[PDB]
Ligand binder design. Structure first.
Ligand SMILES: CC(=O)N[C@H]1[C@@H](OP(=O)(O)OP(=O)(O)OC[C@H]2O[C@@H](n3ccc(=O)[nH]c3=O)[C@H](O)[C@@H]2O)O[C@H](CO)[C@@H](O)[C@@H]1O
Ligand SMILES: CC(=O)N[C@H]1[C@@H](OP(=O)(O)OP(=O)(O)OC[C@H]2O[C@@H](n3ccc(=O)[nH]c3=O)[C@H](O)[C@@H]2O)O[C@H](CO)[C@@H](O)[C@@H]1O
Lengths: 256, 258, 257
């Protein structure tokens, strides 16, 4: 199960059926839960917790210190949930005491080759980060978001649930839930209707989300005006409340 | 000249031809065939079913023949075919095909694929292409001969990159690039013909002028595509190069980078 | 040992006595490593290369590899790296070509983050920061204290000026003058790196002279020639304005506007 050419630190803690491939390093204070497969040529550093049934591929560095100059060697953490796939060359950094001391990833995420997850980022569930996506630090990615290849997210931005970014987008402000963005700099285009259909949203919730986009983006209202105008649909539709909530949480502006 | 470092892992079903080298801590997986004289560096992962031809060079930290990660493309067998005299630099990822399309990723001869480049599932690369650092072919991309993609060129799924074309660094390509065309930017826009390339490869003065003219006919005279094509019939019969240009345009159902 | 028994150290390699080398790393022929330097696991080091003192090189890096530049033909070109540099995961640094310097050169105290690329014949000064996936195509000169943010792309032969700043995803095809901030693809000059200047302790007076100099180059409709002439005076009074002026004067590809 554990290749004899792997190095397993004595204070690492592995569940019974964890696999580790040849020439991988599971460093000190690393915990790996049941059914997780660590590939060959993987470096894991702690303190880090990896859950169950994950898959981590060759040339990944998971749990390293951020090279960010404000980190001074504090024992910050990285927590990863269950059923995640972490592909070739992914870098995931642990947190900083200036935020939460913790980088957190949830469950069922797909993190493709050479993606980067900076210190203090928080990823929800069911997200997809396509190749070379970079979260610079303190980035929050809510459930079911899809960021296409080479998407660059600035520090402190929030990516809403079910949002989508086109290839090579450079994101410098929050992306509301469901919004599709493209370009450098990123601009809002429409809504991720395929992601709604993938999740069996009602046709009525979809039409209401279509209106909700118009309210914020196509009617010249201010954010506050838009918020009041959505208030009703938010109460009627949880789907719309998620949209409404992401815009309300965007203290530092939405992508337009 | 053969040297198989004993720290590498070679599957019993892998097939190695004469003069093959494999560096330490590399993995030549099941159903990988490696042709004559090919050099695999250290820290390479090869996964099959994959056929690699002769006199290739594959550098460290490359993953060649992996499955595409979206499990929505489960299926097997799917394959990878790489021809002869290719250079594959550090950290290159090349994925096999999918049963949902052609079941094969294909690379021809004499290509240079630079560090951290990505060749997505079902893509097809011809011969004498250059993919500069971190070029990313998303999937089902066809790159025709002699094309050059500068550093961090991103190509959308299903796009065709024409023979002898050129992309400036950081291009984001969402539509087909006709043969000989130069594109730049995100999103990518057409700027001119790749005259630097045409000169370096020995194109006739006569062919170069006819291509300069044909660019104008497609992009600058305000014709429709379909008109522009009809106007090119006569030049295309006289100049094989103009024919290659015309054909790339004619086979862009997707649309062309304007 | 300090040298992991699973590493490969070439007989011709020269290592100072307290150098550390992790498992499954390669120190190639004619590679020299100075005192206090730590080489991680899974690092490929090739020569002829000289690495200095107290550097740290992380896993999956290839340092001292041949350039893929098709003009390169197997010549013993060099790579020189100074002291107190950090080279993070997956970084690629290629040696020179005989067609230019025969050497790629890096100074001291630089921070080169993951998957950055330093192309053949580049020269990096001191105290630079190259954020993740910054790519220097070749023959790129980066002067001291420059910060290139993530995914900054630098065309071959470009010069990045001292104390300049590029925004995330910048694609730089022209020279960036000293102290200038650039953003976008294609990169555009926005302002000066005032935040940079304050973090390094520049005097109010120098910052003001630099502010005025920016205007002379970017905001008065001067040709380059005319701006240079008009900066002569202030460049004579302030070393920083001279550095600025020199970066404009030495442009081979024109300057970012
Ligand atoms: C002239 C000089 O100073 N160095 C050159 C030399 O480096 P060098 O000989 O270091 O590079 P190699 O890749 O040939 O070998 C690296 C190291 O790995 C070892 N090894 C190699 C293969 C193997 O199967 N098992 C094994 O143990 C060698 O014994 C050596 O110590 O060749 C390289 C091209 O190949 C060039 O880029 C370098 O410029
Ligand atoms: C594949 C290869 O050997 N690359 C090297 C080559 O690049 P390359 O041959 O592209 O470099 P040059 O700077 O000499 O090319 C001149 C200019 O022509 C452009 N151009 C190039 C090719 C083309 O088909 N069409 C075109 O328009 C380039 O973008 C550049 O702006 O020389 C550079 C300068 O020593 C090196 O940094 C590269 O490592």
């Amino acid at each position: 199960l554990i290749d004899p050419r792997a190095i397993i630190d004595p204070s690492a803690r592995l569940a019974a059926d964890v696999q580790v491939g040849p020439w991988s390093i599971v460093g000190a204070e690393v915990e790996i839960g049941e059914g997780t497969v660590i590939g060959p040529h993987v470096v894991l550093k702690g303190p880090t917790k990896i859950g169950k049934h994950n898959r981590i591929y060759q040339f990944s560095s998971v749990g390293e210190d951020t090279p960010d100059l404000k980190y001074k060697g504090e024992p910050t953490r990285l927590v990863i949930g269950d059923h995640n796939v972490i592909r070739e060359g992914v870098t995931i950094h642990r947190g900083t005491v200036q935020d939460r001391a913790e980088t957190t990833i949830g469950d069922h995420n797909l993190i493709m080759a050479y993606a980067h997850i900076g210190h203090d980022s928080v990823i929800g569930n069911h997200c997809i980060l396509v190749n070379n996506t970079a979260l610079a630090g303190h980035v929050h990615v809510d459930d079911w978001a899809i960021l296409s290849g080479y998407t660059l997210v600035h520090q402190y931005c929030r990516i809403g649930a079910h949002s989508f970014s086109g290839m090579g987008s450079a994101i410098g402000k929050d992306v509301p839930a469901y919004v599709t963005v493209f370009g450098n700099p990123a601009e809002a285009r429409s809504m991720n209707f395929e992601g709604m259909r993938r999740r069996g949203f009602s046709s009525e919730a979809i039409h209401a989300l279509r209106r909700a986009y118009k309210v914020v983006y196509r009617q010249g209202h201010t954010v506050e005006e838009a918020l009041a105008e959505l208030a009703e649909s938010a109460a009627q539709f949880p789907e719309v409340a998620v949209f409404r909530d992401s815009i309300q949480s965007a203290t530092r502006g939405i992508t337009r």
